[PDB]
Amino acid sequence: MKASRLYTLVLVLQPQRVLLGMKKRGFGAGRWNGFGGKVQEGETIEDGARRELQEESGLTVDALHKVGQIVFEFVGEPELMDVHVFCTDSIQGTPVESDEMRPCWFQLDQIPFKDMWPDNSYWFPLLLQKKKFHGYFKFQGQDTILDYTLREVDTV
């Protein structure tokens, strides 16, 4: 089994809308995603999620709720991405566009799945139902899933 690197993903999910960030630069530009990044040495995963949310969007939160964990495998890449997925409780602030990310709220009847990572179509419905999940997705490139597993869990 490959080594895995820890990442976070934060979904700012309100009753009728979700905040996503559009990757502005680099390959993959134009995809909407939650906020997050690599966990750093010495921080808890949740603190890394809070930190990345703030660094990427400007938003702070007092607490995050862990809602899922998803492992991504990419053909041609040695490491798995172990993504710990959190949802926000009560955000502070306004989201800020950076050179790398444009934030945007989407109503929950307008979730832009076709412009999100393909896996999101599978697990974000569970998140919306207040279900917790574990997933794994193996991608060839950015668009093609070759294998995946997904399970609702009681405890992430």
Ligand X SMILES: Nc1[nH]c(=O)nc2c1ncn2[C@H]1C[C@H](O)[C@@H](COP(=O)(O)OP(=O)(O)OP(=O)(O)O)O1
9, interface contact from ligand X, Na ion, none, CB < 5-8 Å by kind: ligand X
Listed residue (85, 73, 79) closest to 127, CA to CA: 85
| Contact residue for Na ion among 37, 58, 112, 118 (CB under 5 A) | 37
Q: Which residues contact 110 (CB under 8 A, 6 or more apart)?
A: none
Residue 37: how many other CB atoms lie within 10 Å? 17
* Stretch near ligand X under the rule CB under 6 A, chosen from 5-13, 58-66, 101-109, 146-154: 5-13
- Using only the alpha carbons of the chain, give its radius of gyration: 15
Could you tell me the smallest distance in angstroms from the CB atom of residue 90 to ligand X? 21
| Contact residue for ligand X among 18, 22, 68, 72 (CB under 6 A) | 72
For residue 49, which phi and psi values (nearest 5 degrees)?
A: -65, -45
Binding interface with ligand X (CB under 6 A): 7-9, 33-34, 36-38, 72, 81, 83, 117, 119-120
